Symmetry: C2
Subunit: 112 residues, 2 copies
């Protein structure tokens, strides 16, 4: 899979999972989230050559088209595949609010 | 939607559907497909600013992160949303083969 095991601690140009830890206050200026203070959002980035983790038939065809005609700028894109949720705690005055946000953390990537 | 109505015949920088007709033989060198001779594959391309057709919570958060820190190269990507199939006819010797390929044509885009 295009996951941490394959992707982290390898520097490759093709589509792969890239690590990214976001500190809510420091990076986004969100001072209102109480816990957690940050999380491993991660992201997907890299080239999508022919048949490299192709999502659909369209990704397969476009990955071949883009190899032949790169000027078209029609390459498939390296995007999230598997994601995980994140539970946050924030206050609303003194009313503690707990919310489970789905699809917050990316665990694997694909060429779509 | 980020579809033909909004996107074609407008030249915008943000994520949008882009037209692309592929001629099998001329563009891909696939001489073995009998009908159709080509089709409207189309593609998705363009910038993903904060909240522009955000797919998941991760796309929402990363679109804000990328606005503040563009060097990170962590932007969400403009990718297919709705797709359509395409039926092709090809021969295998003199055995006509008919296949319906799913997700061949892109009709709308999203920032994922």
């Amino acid at each position: 899979a295009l996951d941490a095991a394959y992707c982290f601690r390898n520097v490759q140009d093709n589509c792969c999972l890239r690590p990214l830890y976001i500190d809510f206050k420091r990076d986004l200026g969100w001072k209102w989230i109480h816990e957690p203070k940050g999380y491993n959002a991660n992201f997907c980035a890299g080239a999508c050559p022919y048949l490299w983790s192709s999502d659909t038939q369209h990704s397969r065809v476009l990955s071949l088209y883009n190899t032949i005609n790169p000027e078209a700028s029609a390459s498939p894109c390296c995007v999230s595949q598997d994601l995980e949720p994140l539970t946050i705690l924030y206050y609303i005055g003194k009313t503690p609010k707990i919310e489970q946000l789905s699809n917050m953390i990316v665990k694997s990537c694909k060429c779509s």
